[PDB]
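Holo prediction — proflavin.
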Amino acid sequence: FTTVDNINLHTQVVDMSMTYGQQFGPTYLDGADVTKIKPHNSHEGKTFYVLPNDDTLRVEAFEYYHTTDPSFLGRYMSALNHTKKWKYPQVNGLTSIKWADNNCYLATALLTLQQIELKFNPPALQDAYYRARAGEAANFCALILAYCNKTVGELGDVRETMSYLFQHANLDSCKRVLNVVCKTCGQQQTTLKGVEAVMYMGTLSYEQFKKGVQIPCTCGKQATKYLVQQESPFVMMSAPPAQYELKHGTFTCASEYTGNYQCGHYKHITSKETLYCIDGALLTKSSEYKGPITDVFYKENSYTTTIK
Ligand SMILES: Nc1ccc2cc3ccc(N)cc3nc2c1
Ligand SMILES: Nc1ccc2cc3ccc(N)cc3nc2c1
Ligand SMILES: Nc1ccc2cc3ccc(N)cc3nc2c1
Ligand SMILES: [Zn+2]
């Protein structure tokens, strides 16, 4: 049969005698590009993916992936063909990835997602992610790449990745309320719902954000932003990478990034019965940790401030 999602099969195949070179639009047996080949006896009955190019396919594809972008399922299949060949060790019970093709950012992403409460909207993500959590994460990875519109081998940012991915989860009952106090301009409160309710960029410390954090006011001058209320299952605090101390028990996990713009390397840190650094397939444990951190994730429930 022919498919776009592998749940819905259309045996509009030529199963017993084709032999015009895969005149089915682009085709893909098990994620290998087979567009330009005539069929090999032992094919009849296996399932080939094809690009959604009639009204009926474009629907099922949209319902499954939650985009209609045509190049999507191409870029997906492209990436799958590589990520199928990466290895996915469990480390301390989490699915990670053996380094290949600058995949460090994807490893870190993957590791964080297994540690954070999300529900993805597109069935494809929900599906893929279950498999990932279970150890076989080639699809999940291929999808993530297609969704962020990056190709295997191209360098990636973990914050940018999560950001895209959160576009596709159910965060709508997530709420953040901020107050900005200016000496001359007085106060100014702000409510954020959805993705922007869970992400801050400028400080790593959640404590510091509750205590208050100096920012330039819109008049130019000296103000304090603080978190008045938070309702979400986690928060993600980010900044440009800087030497930072992670203390046990006080965050859930974090991504560090050492290197520079052209060459660098992400590792994942997670606070358990000790601090575990997971660096693709590698694992080390220490009681201290200081290092160039870029993103920290905290478990949240509901928080309200007590600042008068
Ligand atoms: N992995 C990396 C590496 C360098 C980075 C430099 C940055 C500078 C400004 C900003 N707002 C975010 C950044 N994030 C980075 C993330
Ligand atoms: N893997 C990498 C390497 C360099 C990077 C440099 C950055 C500069 C600004 C920004 N906002 C994000 C960045 N992310 C990076 C991610
Ligand atoms: N300071 C640095 C700079 C670049 C780096 C590039 C890497 C690539 C793969 C890998 N497994 C580890 C790396 N560590 C780096 C450490
Ligand atoms: Zn002001």
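READOUT: Residues 71-83 form the longest helix (13 residues).
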